[PDB]
Amino acid sequence: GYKIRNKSIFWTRAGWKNNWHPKNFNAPRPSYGEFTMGIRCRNDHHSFLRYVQTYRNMSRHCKQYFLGDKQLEETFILGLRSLFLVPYDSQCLTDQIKHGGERRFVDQLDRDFELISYNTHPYQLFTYTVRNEHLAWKNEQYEKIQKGEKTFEQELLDYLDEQVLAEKAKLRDGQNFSIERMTEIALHVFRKARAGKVRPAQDVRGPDGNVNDFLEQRRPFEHPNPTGVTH
Amino acid sequence: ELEELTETHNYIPGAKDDVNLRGYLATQFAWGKKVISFYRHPADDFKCAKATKNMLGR
Amino acid sequence: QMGFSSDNPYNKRWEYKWKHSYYTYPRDYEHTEVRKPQDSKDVPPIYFAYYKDFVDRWLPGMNMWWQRRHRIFDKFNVYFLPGMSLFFYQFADLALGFKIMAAFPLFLAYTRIRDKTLDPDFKETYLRDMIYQNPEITKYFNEETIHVLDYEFEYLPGYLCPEKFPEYQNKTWQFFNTDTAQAEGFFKFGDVESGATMTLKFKTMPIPGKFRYQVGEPFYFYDLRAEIKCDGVYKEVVLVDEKESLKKIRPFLFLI
Amino acid sequence: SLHEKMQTDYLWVKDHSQADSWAKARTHGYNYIAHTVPNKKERYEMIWRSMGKSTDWELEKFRLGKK
Amino acid sequence: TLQWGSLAERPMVDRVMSTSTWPVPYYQRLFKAYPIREKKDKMSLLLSDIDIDDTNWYQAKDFLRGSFRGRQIVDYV
Amino acid sequence: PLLQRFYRRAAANEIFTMEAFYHENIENKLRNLMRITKGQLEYWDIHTSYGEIR
Amino acid sequence: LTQYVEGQIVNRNQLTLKKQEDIEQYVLKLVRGYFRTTNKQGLNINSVLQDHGLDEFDSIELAMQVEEDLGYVISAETIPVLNKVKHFVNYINHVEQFKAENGKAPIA
Amino acid sequence: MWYKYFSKQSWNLRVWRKANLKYNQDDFGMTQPKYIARFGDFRFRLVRTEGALRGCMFFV
Amino acid sequence: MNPIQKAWLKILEPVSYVINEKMAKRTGIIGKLGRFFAIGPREYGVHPINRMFIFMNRKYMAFQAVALHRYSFVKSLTHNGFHMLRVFRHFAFVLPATVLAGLGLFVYWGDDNKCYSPDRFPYLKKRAGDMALPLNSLNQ
Amino acid sequence: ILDYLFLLDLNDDLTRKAVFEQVIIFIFIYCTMNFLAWSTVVELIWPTHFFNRRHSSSQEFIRFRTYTEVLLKISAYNDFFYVLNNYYYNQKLILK
Amino acid sequence: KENTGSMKKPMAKAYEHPYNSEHHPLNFSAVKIAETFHDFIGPEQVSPHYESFA
Amino acid sequence: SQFVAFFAIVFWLFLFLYTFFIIEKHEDFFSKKREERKKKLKELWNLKN
Amino acid sequence: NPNTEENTIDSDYLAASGTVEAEKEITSIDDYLGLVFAIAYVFGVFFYVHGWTSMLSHAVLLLSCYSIIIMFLFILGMPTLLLYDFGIFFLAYLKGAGK
Amino acid sequence: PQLWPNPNKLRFADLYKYQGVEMKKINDSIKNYKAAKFYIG
Ligand SMILES: CCCCCCCCCCCCCCCCCC(=O)OC[C@H](COP(=O)([O-])OCC(O)COP(=O)([O-])OC[C@@H](COC(=O)CCCCCCCCCCCCCCCCC)OC(=O)CCCCCCCCCCCCCCCCC)OC(=O)CCCCCCCCCCCCCCCCC
Ligand SMILES: CCCCCCCCCCCCCCCCCC(=O)OC[C@H](COP(=O)([O-])OCC(O)COP(=O)([O-])OC[C@@H](COC(=O)CCCCCCCCCCCCCCCCC)OC(=O)CCCCCCCCCCCCCCCCC)OC(=O)CCCCCCCCCCCCCCCCC
Ligand SMILES: CCCCCCCCCCCCCCCCCC(=O)OC[C@H](COP(=O)([O-])OCC(O)COP(=O)([O-])OC[C@@H](COC(=O)CCCCCCCCCCCCCCCCC)OC(=O)CCCCCCCCCCCCCCCCC)OC(=O)CCCCCCCCCCCCCCCCC
Ligand SMILES: CCCCCCCCCCCCCCCCCC(=O)OC[C@H](COP(=O)([O-])OCC(O)COP(=O)([O-])OC[C@@H](COC(=O)CCCCCCCCCCCCCCCCC)OC(=O)CCCCCCCCCCCCCCCCC)OC(=O)CCCCCCCCCCCCCCCCC
Ligand SMILES: CCCCCCCCCCCCCCCCCC(=O)OC[C@H](COP(=O)([O-])OCC[N+](C)(C)C)OC(=O)CCCCCCCCCCCCCCCCC
Ligand SMILES: CCCCCCCCCCCCCCCCCC(=O)OC[C@H](COP(=O)([O-])OCC[N+](C)(C)C)OC(=O)CCCCCCCCCCCCCCCCC
Ligand SMILES: COC1=C(OC)C(=O)C(C/C=C(\C)CC/C=C(\C)CC/C=C(\C)CC/C=C(\C)CC/C=C(\C)CC/C=C(/C)CC/C=C(\C)CCC=C(C)C)=C(C)C1=O
Ligand SMILES: Nc1ncnc2c1ncn2[C@@H]1O[C@H](COP(=O)(O)OP(=O)(O)OP(=O)(O)O)[C@@H](O)[C@H]1O
Ligand SMILES: [Mg+2]
């Protein structure tokens, strides 16, 4: 499609794609004991254990509001690890960061836990909303199954199993029913099904170039005055 | 994620993005071409200071 | 004993060392188990951030001064500096120079109280490097498998026996100090691989080094003993013996 | 190969003898820009393409050079 | 071109119609109308080019455990 | 010239194009991930025929 | 002393092992219960957790679960050394022996 | 295993009370002169450092 | 739709019956007039002033959260929490104080709300019919 | 009752300083100015975030899943996604 | 055997935050400000005419 | 000219003379984790991601 | 659309160009960013940035007259707090060892 | 689906009990007005 044409896009004064130690005039320089009288520094060697305790708190303090949902605790754990594995797998050389990446990430995670302790972190609220929307749909299926009724998801699974038999019952010259064929059969069913639903307009433009919004009503004028409520 | 950057006051654009491509496009012709360091917070200050036998910490 | 301690249950020996980046303090202390939404209090009360900074930063800081108040009750802090502050306070209205000479001995008293009430912090990295050099300890202990069960380290009160340490029988040094600046403690260690345990008892004192007026090491282990205990073997290691260490170096006797 | 073959070829990239004496546009179009025409965005693309040919698409030379 | 006409007729030159209908409405739509902030049944488009990870086998078990043959596969693996 | 403001237009005009070509750029990234996925599914097509081969 | 379990409140129970054989059976049940653990039957006393799909962060979740079941208060300085099944067993003994002699729990 | 990840290159200094104990005060500064008398010796003996002395005499 | 619109409906319930059922369809002009003054859901009934407040309330509040969420000047004095060198720590409580002062933006708007206006010259002009007076009128 | 409450007076402030009535004008302007400056800084991080999360990926590197992408995949999948997974499973893993 | 499959009763609901709503979101972003801004300026005033008003 | 000289001296130079950053580090556990983490992902890289 | 509206383009890239200079390591950008806004109405008078404040008071340069004082006081305190950060050794940080 | 309200083909009683997105916002605002009774009081 389109690729960045500038070959020097990732160049910095410090090197190629360097976002760990940008070049600045006041660069780090060494210190010599025999000549150093006093010093004021905030660096220390406590980040490793603070990285550990921070993980335990963020996990244990967020589980307070999961109500024993084991599947959510396990899903949240996978998401929590993705937040702590950022420095271990990033392109950025987190080991060469300016003034210590270890202290930087730890202090950054602490600001997240502060919000987690109050149950105000956006990832928490995002989790509650996403889960409630999920359980409502699983309960809708349960109520339909207890009534002996068939779910919309099973009607497709059953409608797709038969469509495969019809295709392989005529596919006798060959006998390699690829995953590609299996896929485009389902998509042909999904498009037909989705179009059947009364969904809000998602694409800007319909079959014509014109937009599918309620505002795309141009001339000619054929609508009369609006009518009132009926008694 | 945008709320997370705001509530943690990580309002330096592209600090938590491993490849701040938007940051390279804006600095293509900048003086002192540089991008923000990874996970840089606008409040952290790692400045130090020392006193030596010479003046100005030298 | 750790002076700076809050109601937080975890990481007691690191509470004063760890510098958190929090804007305010967490709503609840670190949980020891998963709790219920009703176990905590949503939307904490008004003026809660100011309350936490008092019970988590101010109060444990004053408990430290009160725990180690026996180290600041010297004639220099109690009589000299206050008396020097009052002599010039009677003339504070005559000029600004008296206000300064009346407040300086008070800022000086705070500095000595501040430094003397802090928990005694030795260079633990020098210690672990010392024990991991001994083959009798590395036979059962390794940094990747060692864990701390208990830690105690506190100053020794009052002047010591005036035969082992005749240095502290100095009326000039006593005028500035009421304690010795020495510390004694132990370390309960365990190894998750060998299952071994040992009690690393040690005594420390400040010593002079390589210079005339400045101290060399405020916490020098002149006695370092380890009573190692394993499945069925009991060993006693002596890394530093006091009978042989006190013949070569003597304490420093801090002034001011 | 054929791509690099013609790039290196002097004949394919060679100014005519009188090219030096000709009137030369010494701008890429960034000095006076059309801001309100419907092809506005198309104009910027031609400026970007002209700046790139001058530097072999290594725009660091433009950043370092004189404007 | 840079000479498109008068200022009053400027909003006229933007429309490009896909049909031969006359007269043609001049207004060229800028955005899509979004009156109601509806939660889209559509799945998020961020899930686009993410390499294989732990979420793939965790979700496979959840779907396999929905079948009798799948419960055997998971427990044995 | 003081081209600072122009540099901000050139980058925005370039991003305008990258957004217009989002579908193509992403579809090409998946064409390689699908290649990797299709390659791993070849091991299952071989095992399903072992019972018939035997 | 109560916790939610699938939306229902349940009273939590604390365990007292005080026996080497019961400790090995507990840790194995603990590790096998973790959803990230592989080769649950190939797990033994001398099994490295890295060989079963566990990292440093998974050793924390395991310790966090030990505090739930046994009532321990484990410090962050002790967690990063728990990298084997044998390590969880010896740590549990060191805690029980420490409380039997010193009359108090280890420093947290 | 925090000592495993501790870098010994921080041992270049021995910081205590905002002062490096590995400072050759015998060769540089107000403390280098060894011809100092009873008063000057007792003065440095109290403070141990010229930096703290100069700072206090600044306000005095 | 809002409660005030529903209140109008219960009061105009019989009026709606006369316009929409009888007049809106009788014939001729009485129809055009009844279909023009029909009663129902308001076409373009949104209130931009309400929306203007909702937008400006949200935008100004996002600014309050930034200005009020600052690191403490008091905690940075000890050099023991998160701040060793902060040469502009004395600017920490300027924006918070500036936002809290914004609560008096409307309480103290104009000169009359900052003092006792009858002791000021502009009050005399208002009582004289918004008429220009010599500057020394408060003395004579 | 104390005299400290006299500071609440503005009827007779012209007898002491007459300065409050003018300084708060600046404070209202200073707040307004910062509201426009800070709101622009903190709000305008979204274009960069919206772009990078959608165009910064490359095929020569691994794109790692975030927290949100984990929850959305496991706890926010739609019906067609559930059908397609089981449709593939039943056909190939069960029915071959 | 597969036809015999049944379903387990899932949880009734997750945690409901008592201080977060769709119209009064607890946390801040330019997304909600944009939603309120467009409610204020209203929808794009599309002209249905063949010629511009001026 | 005086505008630049003001900020280049009051802030940029003033702080370059009286403040600095240390080159010595106290903790280097990211370097060794990235190596071990890269061996855990050795197979996925073999697939060229 | 942040890629077609030049108003958000100018403000977005301008702010990004200002915050990226935190790598110059002056001090916390979260602290001194507010002073930059005040200093802008001191030297921005040359560019008429104070125009929108002409009806807000009887003095068009009111905000500029206060900002120059603000700019002076807080810059006067920057060295004072820096010495407070050095401690009692602050004289050694300046001159070094005595003679 | 087809029972969805239409502003033209609407009954009087139905409009009185519509309770659309506009009211849903107001009910959220009212939830805050009530919860602020002690703070304001
Ligand atoms: C007149 C107006 C008065 C108004 C009074 C107002 C009220 C005042 C009250 C308040 C007083 C201020 C408070 C001070 C204390 C505050 C704390 C403090 O600051 O620290 C102390 C502070 C420490 O001093 P320092 O500089 O840090 O020490 C230097 C080294 O560190 C030291 O190094 P060191 O210790 O290793 O050894 C030092 C010395 C070794 O010293 C020793 O070892 C000697 C020790 C002897 C001890 C004696 C013991 C006595 C015991 C008591 C007696 C026995 C008991 C018997 C009892 C009997 C009972 C009846 O070695 C040397 O060789 C030194 C260099 C040689 C001397 C240089 C002198 C230069 C003077 C130039 C002027 C010359 C004038 C000559 C003509 C004068 C004729 C009038 O003391 C001072 O600052 C002293 C004042 C300095 C001011 C100088 C500016 C004035 C210049 C001189 C005057 C010039 C003349 C001007 C007019 C002339 C008109 C004719
Ligand atoms: C009796 C009733 C029953 C009571 C019993 C119940 C008791 C329960 C109490 C419950 C809670 C009480 C709350 C307080 C306890 C807090 C404890 C705690 O741990 O909190 C830590 C807490 C933790 O920090 P955070 O939670 O992260 O954030 C806290 C704040 O949000 C923001 O934190 P921040 O640190 O960022 O805020 C800094 C701000 C804090 O705001 C203030 O405190 C205002 C400070 C104004 C005084 C500054 C003194 C300067 C030194 C002058 C030395 C002479 C003094 C002479 C005084 C004579 C007075 C006439 O101060 C500044 O702005 C620093 C810059 C100062 C201006 C720069 C220039 C300074 C030099 C100017 C010299 C001019 C001289 C010219 C001529 C000289 C010629 C000699 O920090 C606090 O300090 C909390 C303070 C909360 C506000 C309290 C005040 C509320 C307003 C009440 C109305 C005014 C009445 C008091 C007026 C006092 C005199 C003006
Ligand atoms: C006692 C009896 C008194 C009351 C009697 C009652 C009746 C009173 C009259 C009320 C009239 C209401 C209905 C007409 C209103 C709109 C008229 C109009 O031309 O707008 C159509 C025009 C586009 O309509 P279109 O043909 O469908 O094209 C659509 C395209 O999207 C457009 O974009 P495009 O780029 O694609 O196409 C080109 C675009 C070209 O136009 C534009 O794109 C922008 C035009 C410049 C906008 C003005 C910028 C001014 C900056 C603010 C400074 C003044 C603020 C006012 C308050 C200051 C303090 C007093 O539009 C055009 O096609 C040609 C433009 C025609 C002239 C435009 C300028 C008209 C004056 C607007 C400002 C009036 C205030 C200043 C006048 C002096 C005040 C004493 O829209 C605008 O011009 C919007 C600007 C705001 C218009 C409303 C402003 C208030 C009413 C203005 C009445 C104008 C006559 C009086 C002033 C003229 C003095 C020289
Ligand atoms: C209109 C006025 C305009 C002027 C405006 C100026 C405003 C300035 C505002 C700046 C902020 C000031 C606030 C100070 C906060 C202090 C807080 C505190 O106490 O913490 C302690 C803190 C020290 O802690 P550290 O350094 O972090 O660590 C200490 C070490 O651990 C310690 O290590 P070590 O244990 O080895 O050291 C030993 C010992 C050594 O100490 C000694 O040197 C010993 C001295 C001799 C003592 C006497 C010995 C007597 C011996 C008697 C022997 C008897 C023998 C008997 C024998 C017995 C016979 C039986 O050192 C100490 O412990 C003492 C250090 C603390 C001294 C604090 C002095 C403060 C004096 C301030 C007085 C005036 C305050 C007025 C405030 C007014 C506010 C409204 O003090 C400081 O940091 C001082 C920094 C202040 C620098 C400010 C510089 C600002 C510029 C000022 C002049 C600018 C002129 C240019 C003007 C241009 C226009 C703008
Ligand atoms: C518009 C309304 C609001 C306006 C608000 C103000 C917005 C300001 C926009 C950002 C301005 C940023 C200026 C940074 C200049 C840095 C240039 C550089 O990197 O040097 C590279 C230069 C040049 O390298 P170069 O590679 O980047 O550029 C090369 C230039 N050519 C092409 C010509 C060769 O080299 C250096 O490193 C020299 C560094 C000198 C730095 C002197 C500037 C110091 C001023 C900044 C400190 C100000 C702090 C103020 C805090 C106040 C608090 C109260
Ligand atoms: C005679 C009239 C009295 C004049 C008024 C004097 C007011 C004195 C009290 C207010 C000022 C207190 C000092 C504030 C500045 C220090 C901030 C701070 O708290 O830091 C704590 C710090 C905490 O250390 P930190 O803040 O550096 O952080 C520690 C490390 N981290 C961050 C990792 C946790 O500790 C101390 O500073 C030591 C204790 C300070 C002592 C302060 C004085 C208290 C006085 C108590 C009086 C008791 C008797 C009278 C009252 C009886 C009550 C009924
Ligand atoms: C607290 O923190 C802060 C915020 O929160 C985050 C902010 O949003 C903000 C920003 C503030 C805003 C965006 C609001 C700005 C408002 C401004 C500028 C003024 C608004 C003016 C109007 C809307 C016009 C009003 C006109 C009038 C009142 C004149 C006519 C009188 C009318 C309409 C009311 C009649 C008068 C009465 C006394 C009767 C009252 C009637 C009632 C109470 C009936 C109510 C009926 C129902 C059904 C509720 C700030 C400054 C802040 O500090
Ligand atoms: N080599 C150094 N270089 C620069 N700053 C240092 C250095 N060493 C210490 N500092 C600063 O002085 C502080 C105190 O150092 P200190 O050795 O007492 O810490 P520590 O945690 O007790 O070490 P240990 O675990 O070995 O006992 C440190 O927190 C640091 O800010
Ligand atoms: Mg120590």
GROMACS .gro file of N, CA, C and O in nm, chain F residues 7-44:
model
  152
  696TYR      N    1   0.680   2.195   0.793
  696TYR     CA    2   0.715   2.061   0.835
  696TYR      C    3   0.599   1.992   0.905
  696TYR      O    4   0.585   1.870   0.898
  697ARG      N    5   0.514   2.069   0.974
  697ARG     CA    6   0.399   2.012   1.041
  697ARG      C    7   0.288   1.976   0.943
  697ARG      O    8   0.208   1.887   0.973
  698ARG      N    9   0.283   2.042   0.828
  698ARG     CA   10   0.185   2.006   0.726
  698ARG      C   11   0.230   1.883   0.648
  698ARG      O   12   0.149   1.794   0.619
  699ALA      N   13   0.358   1.876   0.613
  699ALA     CA   14   0.409   1.765   0.535
  699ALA      C   15   0.390   1.633   0.608
  699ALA      O   16   0.357   1.531   0.546
  700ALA      N   17   0.412   1.632   0.739
  700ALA     CA   18   0.392   1.510   0.816
  700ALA      C   19   0.245   1.474   0.826
  700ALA      O   20   0.208   1.357   0.814
  701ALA      N   21   0.159   1.574   0.846
  701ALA     CA   22   0.016   1.549   0.852
  701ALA      C   23  -0.038   1.503   0.717
  701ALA      O   24  -0.127   1.417   0.711
  702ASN      N   25   0.014   1.559   0.608
  702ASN     CA   26  -0.029   1.516   0.475
  702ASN      C   27   0.018   1.375   0.445
  702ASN      O   28  -0.046   1.304   0.366
  703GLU      N   29   0.128   1.332   0.507
  703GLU     CA   30   0.176   1.196   0.488
  703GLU      C   31   0.095   1.098   0.572
  703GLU      O   32   0.066   0.986   0.527
  704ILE      N   33   0.059   1.137   0.694
  704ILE     CA   34  -0.025   1.052   0.777
  704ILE      C   35  -0.165   1.040   0.719
  704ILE      O   36  -0.229   0.935   0.732
  705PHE      N   37  -0.215   1.145   0.656
  705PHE     CA   38  -0.343   1.137   0.587
  705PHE      C   39  -0.343   1.023   0.486
  705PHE      O   40  -0.446   0.958   0.466
  706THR      N   41  -0.229   0.997   0.423
  706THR     CA   42  -0.220   0.889   0.326
  706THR      C   43  -0.208   0.753   0.395
  706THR      O   44  -0.271   0.656   0.352
  707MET      N   45  -0.127   0.745   0.501
  707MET     CA   46  -0.114   0.619   0.572
  707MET      C   47  -0.248   0.573   0.629
  707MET      O   48  -0.274   0.452   0.635
  708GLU      N   49  -0.332   0.667   0.671
  708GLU     CA   50  -0.465   0.631   0.719
  708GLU      C   51  -0.553   0.582   0.605
  708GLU      O   52  -0.634   0.490   0.623
  709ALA      N   53  -0.540   0.644   0.487
  709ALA     CA   54  -0.619   0.601   0.373
  709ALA      C   55  -0.577   0.462   0.325
  709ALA      O   56  -0.659   0.391   0.265
  710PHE      N   57  -0.453   0.423   0.350
  710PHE     CA   58  -0.402   0.292   0.312
  710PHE      C   59  -0.387   0.199   0.431
  710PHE      O   60  -0.306   0.107   0.430
  711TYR      N   61  -0.467   0.221   0.536
  711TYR     CA   62  -0.460   0.135   0.653
  711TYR      C   63  -0.499  -0.008   0.619
  711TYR      O   64  -0.432  -0.104   0.661
  712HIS      N   65  -0.606  -0.025   0.542
  712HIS     CA   66  -0.657  -0.159   0.513
  712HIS      C   67  -0.556  -0.240   0.433
  712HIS      O   68  -0.537  -0.359   0.459
  713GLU      N   69  -0.489  -0.176   0.337
  713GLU     CA   70  -0.391  -0.247   0.256
  713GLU      C   71  -0.265  -0.278   0.336
  713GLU      O   72  -0.212  -0.389   0.327
  714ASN      N   73  -0.217  -0.182   0.414
  714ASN     CA   74  -0.095  -0.205   0.491
  714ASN      C   75  -0.113  -0.318   0.591
  714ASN      O   76  -0.024  -0.402   0.608
  715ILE      N   77  -0.227  -0.322   0.659
  715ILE     CA   78  -0.251  -0.425   0.760
  715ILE      C   79  -0.275  -0.559   0.694
  715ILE      O   80  -0.226  -0.663   0.740
  716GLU      N   81  -0.351  -0.561   0.584
  716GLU     CA   82  -0.378  -0.687   0.516
  716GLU      C   83  -0.250  -0.755   0.471
  716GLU      O   84  -0.242  -0.878   0.469
  717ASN      N   85  -0.147  -0.677   0.435
  717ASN     CA   86  -0.021  -0.737   0.395
  717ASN      C   87   0.056  -0.792   0.514
  717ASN      O   88   0.129  -0.891   0.501
  718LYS      N   89   0.042  -0.729   0.631
  718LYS     CA   90   0.106  -0.783   0.751
  718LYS      C   91   0.047  -0.918   0.789
  718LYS      O   92   0.118  -1.006   0.839
  719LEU      N   93  -0.083  -0.935   0.768
  719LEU     CA   94  -0.148  -1.062   0.800
  719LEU      C   95  -0.119  -1.169   0.696
  719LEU      O   96  -0.119  -1.288   0.730
  720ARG      N   97  -0.094  -1.130   0.571
  720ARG     CA   98  -0.062  -1.228   0.469
  720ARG      C   99   0.059  -1.312   0.507
  720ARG      O  100   0.070  -1.427   0.464
  721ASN      N  101   0.148  -1.257   0.588
  721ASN     CA  102   0.264  -1.333   0.635
  721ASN      C  103   0.233  -1.412   0.762
  721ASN      O  104   0.285  -1.522   0.780
  722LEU      N  105   0.150  -1.357   0.850
  722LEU     CA  106   0.109  -1.431   0.968
  722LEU      C  107   0.021  -1.549   0.931
  722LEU      O  108   0.032  -1.657   0.991
  723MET      N  109  -0.066  -1.532   0.832
  723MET     CA  110  -0.147  -1.643   0.784
  723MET      C  111  -0.060  -1.749   0.718
  723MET      O  112  -0.090  -1.868   0.727
  724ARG      N  113   0.048  -1.707   0.652
  724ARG     CA  114   0.142  -1.803   0.595
  724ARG      C  115   0.205  -1.888   0.704
  724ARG      O  116   0.219  -2.010   0.688
  725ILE      N  117   0.245  -1.826   0.814
  725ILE     CA  118   0.301  -1.900   0.926
  725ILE      C  119   0.196  -1.993   0.985
  725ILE      O  120   0.226  -2.108   1.020
  726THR      N  121   0.073  -1.946   0.997
  726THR     CA  122  -0.033  -2.027   1.055
  726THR      C  123  -0.067  -2.145   0.964
  726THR      O  124  -0.079  -2.259   1.011
  727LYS      N  125  -0.081  -2.120   0.834
  727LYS     CA  126  -0.108  -2.229   0.741
  727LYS      C  127   0.004  -2.332   0.742
  727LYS      O  128  -0.022  -2.451   0.721
  728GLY      N  129   0.128  -2.289   0.767
  728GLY     CA  130   0.238  -2.383   0.769
  728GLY      C  131   0.234  -2.478   0.887
  728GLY      O  132   0.273  -2.594   0.875
  729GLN      N  133   0.186  -2.430   1.002
  729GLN     CA  134   0.176  -2.515   1.119
  729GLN      C  135   0.059  -2.612   1.110
  729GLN      O  136   0.062  -2.718   1.172
  730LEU      N  137  -0.045  -2.577   1.034
  730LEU     CA  138  -0.158  -2.665   1.016
  730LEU      C  139  -0.129  -2.779   0.918
  730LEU      O  140  -0.214  -2.867   0.903
  731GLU      N  141  -0.013  -2.779   0.853
  731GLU     CA  142   0.023  -2.888   0.764
  731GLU      C  143   0.057  -3.015   0.840
  731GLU      O  144   0.050  -3.124   0.782
  732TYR      N  145   0.094  -3.004   0.967
  732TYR     CA  146   0.128  -3.122   1.045
  732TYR      C  147   0.004  -3.203   1.082
  732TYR      O  148   0.014  -3.325   1.101
  733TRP      N  149  -0.112  -3.139   1.091
  733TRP     CA  150  -0.235  -3.210   1.123
  733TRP      C  151  -0.292  -3.280   1.001
  733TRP      O  152  -0.352  -3.388   1.015
   0.00000   0.00000   0.00000
